[PDB]
């Protein structure tokens, strides 16, 4: 479960929320 939870968080670019190409899909962080 630790391996299956680290991957999901790793597949998230939080630094891309302050790049002006963003929409309401770059903040849908939790449930893809």
């Amino acid at each position: 479960x630790x391996x299956x939870x680290x991957x999901x968080x790793x597949x998230x670019x939080x630094x891309x929320x302050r790049x002006x190409x963003x929409x309401x899909x770059x903040x849908x962080x939790x449930x893809x």
Binding site: X3, X6, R18
Partner: protein, 200 residues
């Protein structure tokens, strides 16, 4: 045991075991716990990722000469040097010492938490992307002396240690991110002439 002299029993026992080991070899030659001991690891759990934050302050240019400022009808909240400030153009704030900037330079502040006007308000959770505040560096100064004194009555104890804190002064120039309410637009030139010296 009544005596307070430290006991030498551990020394006497060690000398006996050392003598036996030196002369009499052991029968076993392996230990399973040592044989299967694995490589050293940093931890047994995945590391916790960090939360990104906007840049604190960055230089964008310099000021050429004397200028003037007028009052506007917008305000904002910015986080800087460990504390928050409510700022509007032509305000003066005092902060801790900021490294890497010089007097008569223009800096850009991006950690904006709140923007407001007379007709609308924008709330960041916790920061507003695409907003910034401009300010001019005016001073790097030593503040007034603070006298630190300690004493303990009847104990012959006394200490004196004066000190001078280091601080920085800024003047707010412009707030970007929210439009003024209708009829509140400043329709004349307001700020200085800035020589841009930061291209990325």
């Amino acid at each position: 045991v009544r005596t307070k002299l430290p006991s030498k029993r551990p020394f006497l026992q060690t000398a006996s075991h050392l003598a036996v080991n030196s002369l009499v070899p052991s029968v076993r030659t392996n230990r399973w716990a040592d044989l299967i001991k694995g490589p050293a690891v940093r931890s047994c759990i995945p590391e916790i990722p960090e939360v990104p934050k906007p840049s604190e302050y960055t230089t964008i240019g310099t000021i050429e000469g004397p200028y003037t400022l007028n009052l506007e009808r917008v305000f904002g909240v910015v986080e800087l040097a460990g504390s928050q400030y409510k700022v509007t153009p032509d305000d003066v704030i005092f902060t801790n010492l900021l490294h890497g900037i010089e007097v008569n330079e223009v800096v850009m502040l991006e950690r904006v938490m709140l923007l407001g006007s007379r007709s609308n308000t924008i709330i960041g959770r916790p920061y507003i992307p695409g907003a910034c505040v401009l300010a001019a560096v005016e001073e790097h100064f030593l503040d007034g002396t603070v006298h630190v004194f300690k004493r303990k009555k009847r104990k012959r104890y006394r200490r004196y240690k004066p000190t001078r804190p280091m601080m920085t002064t800024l003047r707010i120039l412009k707030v970007l991110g929210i439009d003024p309410a209708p009829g509140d637009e400043l329709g004349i030139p307001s700020g200085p002439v800035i020589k841009i010296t930061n291209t990325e």
